[PDB]
Design an enzyme around this catalytic site. Structure first.
Site, PDB file in Angstrom:
ATOM      1  N   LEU A  22       0.862  -1.157   0.000  1.00 62.93           N
ATOM      2  CA  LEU A  22       0.000   0.000   0.000  1.00 62.93           C
ATOM      3  C   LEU A  22       0.914   1.226   0.000  1.00 62.93           C
ATOM      4  CD1 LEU A  22      -2.554  -1.032   2.760  1.00 62.93           C
ATOM      5  CD2 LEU A  22      -2.735  -1.517   0.289  1.00 62.93           C
ATOM      6  N   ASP A  63       2.781  -6.284   2.380  1.00 62.72           N
ATOM      7  CA  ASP A  63       3.312  -5.443   3.421  1.00 62.72           C
ATOM      8  C   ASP A  63       3.859  -6.217   4.639  1.00 62.72           C
ATOM      9  OD1 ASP A  63       3.173  -2.436   3.000  1.00 62.72           O
ATOM     10  OD2 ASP A  63       1.195  -2.979   2.262  1.00 62.72           O
ATOM     11  N   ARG A 135      -5.658   4.654  10.394  1.00 65.51           N
ATOM     12  CA  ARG A 135      -5.472   3.239  10.663  1.00 65.51           C
ATOM     13  C   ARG A 135      -5.811   2.816  12.078  1.00 65.51           C
ATOM     14  NH1 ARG A 135      -6.327   1.762   5.932  1.00 65.51           N
ATOM     15  NH2 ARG A 135      -4.718   2.439   4.415  1.00 65.51           N
ATOM     16  N   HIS A 163       1.049   8.167  10.459  1.00 66.05           N
ATOM     17  CA  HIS A 163       0.998   7.417  11.746  1.00 66.05           C
ATOM     18  C   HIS A 163       1.672   8.298  12.785  1.00 66.05           C
ATOM     19  CE1 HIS A 163       0.042   4.065   9.116  1.00 66.05           C
ATOM     20  NE2 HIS A 163      -0.210   3.261  10.129  1.00 66.05           N
ATOM     21  N   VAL A 258       6.989   2.955   0.067  1.00 66.24           N
ATOM     22  CA  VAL A 258       5.683   2.440   0.485  1.00 66.24           C
ATOM     23  C   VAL A 258       5.472   2.721   2.001  1.00 66.24           C
ATOM     24  CG1 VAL A 258       5.554   0.776  -1.426  1.00 66.24           C
ATOM     25  CG2 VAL A 258       6.623   0.146   0.835  1.00 66.24           C
ATOM     26  N   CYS A 264       9.190   0.529  11.705  1.00 67.89           N
ATOM     27  CA  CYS A 264       8.235  -0.351  11.042  1.00 67.89           C
ATOM     28  C   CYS A 264       8.709  -1.795  10.861  1.00 67.89           C
ATOM     29  CB  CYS A 264       7.882   0.158   9.688  1.00 67.89           C
ATOM     30  SG  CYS A 264       7.324   1.887   9.691  1.00 67.89           S
TER      31      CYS A 264
HETATM   32  C1  LIG Z   1       6.077   4.443  11.832  1.00 64.72           C
HETATM   33  O1  LIG Z   1       4.874   4.378  11.015  1.00 64.72           O
HETATM   34  C2  LIG Z   1       5.212   5.040   9.783  1.00 64.72           C
HETATM   35  C3  LIG Z   1       4.115   4.690   8.792  1.00 64.72           C
HETATM   36  N1  LIG Z   1       4.229   3.327   8.279  1.00 64.72           N
HETATM   37  C4  LIG Z   1       3.653   2.229   8.881  1.00 64.72           C
HETATM   38  N2  LIG Z   1       2.950   2.286  10.039  1.00 64.72           N
HETATM   39  N3  LIG Z   1       3.821   1.026   8.309  1.00 64.72           N
HETATM   40  C5  LIG Z   1       4.609   0.812   7.055  1.00 64.72           C
HETATM   41  C6  LIG Z   1       3.807   1.002   5.727  1.00 64.72           C
HETATM   42  C7  LIG Z   1       2.639   0.025   5.671  1.00 64.72           C
HETATM   43  C8  LIG Z   1       1.821   0.255   4.379  1.00 64.72           C
HETATM   44  N4  LIG Z   1       2.728   0.145   3.226  1.00 64.72           N
HETATM   45  C9  LIG Z   1       1.029   1.570   4.448  1.00 64.72           C
HETATM   46  O2  LIG Z   1       1.260   2.438   3.569  1.00 64.72           O
HETATM   47  O3  LIG Z   1       0.201   1.674   5.397  1.00 64.72           O
END
Ligand SMILES: COCCNC(=N)NCCC[C@H](N)C(=O)O
Length: 272
Positions: A22, A63, A135, A163, A258, A264
């Site tokens: 994603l 992911d 999320r 996030h 991504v 992460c």
């Molecule tokens: C520290 O969090 C940074 C934001 N990223 C995260 N939580 N997960 C990694 C990306 C997961 C996914 N590719 C997305 O766009 O959702």
């Protein structure tokens, strides 16, 4: 001792990540991402001496590398989260089994109205802050509070597809690495307003570069993995001032496309 870890869980990235993970144009170089990921695993396991549990990739879960979003571990308890993107929910299966084998007490977020991504959770050593985001919702945050009963939990709205740790993470005991954008600063103030603990901050000009990994390692002491001067020169100049940290530059440029940053890619655990 804040930041003590003995074990890390990571997970290999699938070929499918390049086209299917994603993302919020930048073409992913999947071979370079694997290289970067292997280097990051090398630091955790080889250079710093953690026992790393390397989960196998699952091509159906693009992911899956991002194990942080699926589990939050605090002391001897693991919350298996219910990720906010429904397509990532089967990632919990392999993580539950790995955390089981590590002898953690497991609590699963099963509530069908609850979502939480581990990347929205900042544990300071004293309390949790939980981003309420695209999320993570209020119910997910409540179930985190219910799980980590020894610690205060507070929520902070997070805007715009971010996030919480998109722009912050712990850089040391009592030390929050925080970005300078309007978003990051608005979030920091809310967090500081909700808590009586007086945190220090390490302010960096690149929000993304505020996402770092602190560890406190036996016979090594303070340790920080941070983004490289080639990626974020003006943020790396800020970390360079940490003269009592062992500083480790780690690249994550490809997984960044991504939205994959340093925190992460692992779940850290302190095992008796
Ligand atoms: C520290 O969090 C940074 C934001 N990223 C995260 N939580 N997960 C990694 C990306 C997961 C996914 N590719 C997305 O766009 O959702």
């Amino acid at each position: 001792a804040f930041g003590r870890a003995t074990h890390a869980v990571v997970r290999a990235l699938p070929e499918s990540l390049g086209q299917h993970a994603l993302r919020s144009g930048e073409e992913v170089d999947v071979a370079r991402a694997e290289r970067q990921h292997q280097l990051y695993v090398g630091v955790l396991g080889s250079k710093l001496g953690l026992q790393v549990v390397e989960l196998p990739a699952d091509e159906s879960l693009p992911d899956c590398v991002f194990v942080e979003d699926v589990a939050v571990v605090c002391e001897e308890t693991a919350l298996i989260t219910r990720p906010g993107a429904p397509s990532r929910r089967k990632e919990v299966d392999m993580m539950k089994e790995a955390l089981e084998k590590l002898q953690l007490n497991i609590v699963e977020m099963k509530d069908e109205n609850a979502t939480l991504d581990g990347g929205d959770v900042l544990f300071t050593g004293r309390e949790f802050f939980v981003g309420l985001s695209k999320r993570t919702n209020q119910r997910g945050a409540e179930i985190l509070a219910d799980t980590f009963k020894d610690y205060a939990v507070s929520t902070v709205p997070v805007a715009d597809g971010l996030h919480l740790k998109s722009f912050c993470s712990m850089a040391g005991p009592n030390l929050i690495a925080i970005g300078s954008s309007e978003s990051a600063q608005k979030a920091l103030k809310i967090m500081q307003q909700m808590s009586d603990h007086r945190y220090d901050k390490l302010t960096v000009p690149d929000d993304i570069a505020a996402n770092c990994i602190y560890l406190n390692i036996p016979n090594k002491g303070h340790v920080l993995l941070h983004r490289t001067p080639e990626e974020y020169p003006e943020s790396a100049k800020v970390y360079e001032k940490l003269k009592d940290h062992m500083l480790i530059p780690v690249s994550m440029s490809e997984l960044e496309k991504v939205d994959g940053l340093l925190t992460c890619c692992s779940v850290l655990i302190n095992k008796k």
